[PDB]
């Protein structure tokens, strides 16, 4: 079990890093995050945010994978589940705006466990 706040990924324009938390906005954006996976299997994944203004639709960058998830920015660190299987070695996780799914979106955190 470990996470990595956005003060330590990369903070792509238009993101920016704001309170430890990167800031999604149009298309380009990226917050992604450099790690391996101890093994080859599903792990919990979880994502965190606190943003005290409101967002969009959005898409999850999660193990290179990009799921179309929409919301707002809530100023409260909400968390959601997520279970996806990575593969052993370098991966790159993290949340980005898409063409067809685009929204301002503050990242407090990616979490990554051994579902349960």
């Not at 003060?7 to 380009?28: C, F, K, M, R």
């Not at 101890?38 to 959005?58: A, D, F, H, M, Q």
């Amino acid at each position: 079990s470990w996470t990595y706040t956005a003060a330590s990924a990369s903070i792509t324009a238009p993101a920016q890093l704001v309170g430890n938390v990167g800031e999604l906005q149009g298309a380009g954006s990226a917050v992604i995050w450099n790690v391996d996976v101890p093994v080859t299997g599903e792990y919990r994944i979880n994502l965190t945010w606190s943003s005290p203004y409101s967002s969009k639709v959005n898409t999850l960058v999660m193990d290179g994978t990009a799921l179309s998830y929409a919301f707002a920015e809530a100023t409260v660190p909400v968390t959601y589940v997520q279970t996806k299987t990575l593969s052993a070695g370098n991966h790159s996780f993290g949340v980005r705006v898409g063409s067809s799914d685009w929204g301002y979106m503050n990242v407090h955190s990616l979490k990554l466990e051994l579902l349960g």
